[PDB]
């Protein structure tokens, strides 16, 4: 359940 | 009636700025800085903008407008300004003007309104 982050982190989960 | 009143030290930096009319081409301070500060008459016309000025200790006190105005009136107004701050500080110079910011701005606020010389 990650944050308003860039693409890579969106890749990690959520 | 009167566009603005600006005061500069002998280096050329602008000590004080007040504009009464927001029809400003903002190189006016730069116009007086490059044309006069860094000429042969107290009133100089720069691009249909008339500049009057006086010089106390080595500081420059200048007034600006595009309208046709009473020249003696604005010159004696500059004299009134110089007398008021010569009473308030004793010596018009870089530090005496620099150390009192709001006093000069709020006294000038009472002296004239939108380029119109008032009385205290």
């Amino acid at each position: 359940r990650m944050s308003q982050i860039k693409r890579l982190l969106s890749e990690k989960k959520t | 009636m009167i566009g603005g009143l600006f005061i500069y030290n002998h280096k050329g930096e602008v000590l004080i700025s007040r504009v009464y009319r927001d029809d400003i081409g903002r190189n006016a301070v730069d116009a007086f800085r490059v044309n006069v500060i860094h000429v042969r008459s107290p009133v100089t016309n720069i691009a249909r903008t008339s500049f009057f000025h006086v010089k106390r200790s080595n500081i420059w006190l200048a007034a600006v407008t595009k309208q046709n105005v009473n020249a003696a009136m604005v010159f004696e107004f500059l004299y009134k300004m110089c007398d008021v701050m010569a009473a308030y500080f004793g010596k018009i110079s870089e530090e005496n003007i620099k150390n009192n910011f709001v006093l000069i701005y709020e006294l000038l606020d009472e002296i004239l309104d939108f380029g119109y010389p008032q009385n205290s």
Binding site: - | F52, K66, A72, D113
Partner: protein, 480 residues
């Protein structure tokens, strides 16, 4: 990781409308003052602040009117009891651009402060009286403002009086009393600082052109003195040559000769222009004036020599064939002439005295070769001089006049010069005797006040004495 380890790396080493009925008049005025400073198209709000009974609020609201008819452009006030408000009203109206409602305007004048007096003077100066026999009381009950401590009030009072002084010219000497009363305040205005005395000197130049009598005797007052600044020195020189007389010329030239030794180029040039100009009023000096000028031409300092040659062209114009002998020595300075005015002066005098000048054709041909590099002011005078020389020697000057006409007509980019060349060509081709009649005719000899602010322009500037128009000697159309 810890902050110690991290800090080691990171460290390098609206509400204003509700105040219509507000009790406090100071804050009412502050609100209506800030209304004129806030710039937006979002704006009985001011009508009630004018309905206000506090005159300070009124004068402040009157100026706010102008403040916000500046960003957005799309009578009863001068009847109020406070001279301050009745003066701010006229100031605002003059910025925005009857004899019975000004009945107490001239008394609110005396009750106002200096700035209000200036405002009322500037407003009333633009007024015109219908009946002089009953409006000369205006000048009467406006004379006390003369010699008020402020220079603006005395300047605007002189403006209104100069404008209004057109009454019967021997008036049981009311005309002369006002003529004589106007002089002491103008002469005391020189006691002020350099800027005020310079604007006063500009206005005195204007007024001495208009009514030269007022200060007939004050030419020694206007002499140049060391500690005078340069701009006021030039103005003093001009007014001194204004007021010079048939007996004054001796002293004024004695002083001008000494002035001619100065370091300031502008001063020295104006000084030799003046020692030339003297010959307009006095002729017995003329010859020796000329002599001095010739010796200056010998000194050969170009900036003084060329102004001297300009004034001797004007003196040739005023004294036909009296100093025809100097022409040759003047021609002696062929290549040293570089300013357009001096070149045109020499060209005109050679075109006019080609009768004595045997080589006027060659003298004027020498200029046809740099015709497009000369200025338009020089080109027009050269064309006129060559057509005059052609009419004087039509059996030897055909090549020359045809060349200048072809230049002016064919290669010129200036429509005015091209039309003048076409006019000259067509007149010469149609009627040579009539062309002579037209151009080589007898001309009304130059005579009077040399700097000659235009007849109509001077009466226009008379009603602008307080304004920058007077100090610029140019209308407010040339600069706003």
């Amino acid at each position: 990781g810890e902050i110690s380890e991290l800090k080691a790396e990171l460290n390098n080493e609206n509400s204003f409308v509700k105040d219509c009925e507000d009790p406090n008049p100071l804050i009412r005025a502050l609100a209506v003052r800030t209304m004129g400073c806030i710039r937006v198209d979002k704006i009985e709000p001011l009508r009630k602040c004018l309905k206000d009974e506090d005159p300070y609020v009124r004068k402040t609201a009157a100026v706010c009117v102008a403040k916000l008819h500046d960003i957005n452009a799309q009578r009863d006030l001068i009847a109020d009891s406070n001279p301050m408000v009745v003066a701010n009203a006229v100031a605002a109206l003059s910025e925005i651009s009857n004899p019975q409602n000004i009945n107490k305007l001239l008394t609110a004048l005396n009750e106002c402060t200096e700035w209000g007096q200036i405002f009322i003077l500037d407003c009333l100066s633009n007024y015109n009286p219908k009946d002089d026999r009953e409006a000369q009381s205006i000048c009467e009950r406006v004379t006390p403002r003369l010699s008020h401590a402020n220079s603006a009030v005395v300047l605007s009072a002189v403006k209104v009086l100069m404008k209004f002084l057109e009454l019967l010219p021997k008036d049981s000497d009311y005309y002369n009393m006002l003529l004589k009363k106007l002089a002491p305040p103008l002469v005391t205005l020189l006691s002020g600082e350099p800027e005020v005395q310079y604007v006063a000197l500009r206005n005195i130049n204007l007024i001495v052109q208009k009514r030269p009598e007022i200060l007939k005797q004050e030419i020694k007052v206007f002499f140049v003195k060391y500690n005078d600044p340069i701009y006021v020195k030039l103005e003093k020189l001009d007014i001194m040559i204004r007021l010079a007389s048939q007996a004054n010329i001796a002293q004024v030239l004695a002083e001008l000769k000494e002035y001619a030794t100065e370091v300031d180029v502008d001063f020295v040039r104006k000084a030799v222009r003046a020692i030339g100009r003297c010959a307009i009023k006095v002729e017995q000096s003329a010859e020796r004036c000329v002599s001095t000028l010739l010796d200056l031409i010998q000194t050969k300092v170009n900036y003084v020599v060329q102004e001297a040659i300009v004034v001797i062209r004007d003196i040739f114009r005023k004294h036909p064939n009296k100093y025809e002998s100097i022409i040759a020595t003047l021609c002696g300075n062929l290549d040293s002439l570089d300013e357009p005015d001096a070149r045109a002066a020499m060209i005109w005098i050679v075109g006019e005295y080609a009768e004595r000048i045997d080589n006027a054709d060659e003298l004027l041909e020498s200029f046809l070769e740099g015709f497009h590099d000369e200025s338009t002011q020089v080109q027009l005078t050269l064309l006129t001089a060559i057509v005059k020389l052609f009419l004087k020697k039509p059996s030897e000057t055909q090549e020359l006049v045809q060349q200048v006409l072809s230049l002016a007509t064919q290669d010129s980019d200036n429509p005015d010069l091209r039309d003048r060349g076409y006019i000259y060509w067509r007149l010469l081709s149609t009627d040579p005797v009539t062309a002579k009649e037209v151009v080589l005719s007898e001309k009304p000899l130059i005579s009077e006040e040399t700097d000659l602010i235009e007849p109509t322009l001077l009466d226009e500037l008379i009603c602008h004495i307080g304004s920058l128009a007077s100090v610029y000697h140019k209308p407010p159309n040339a600069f706003v």
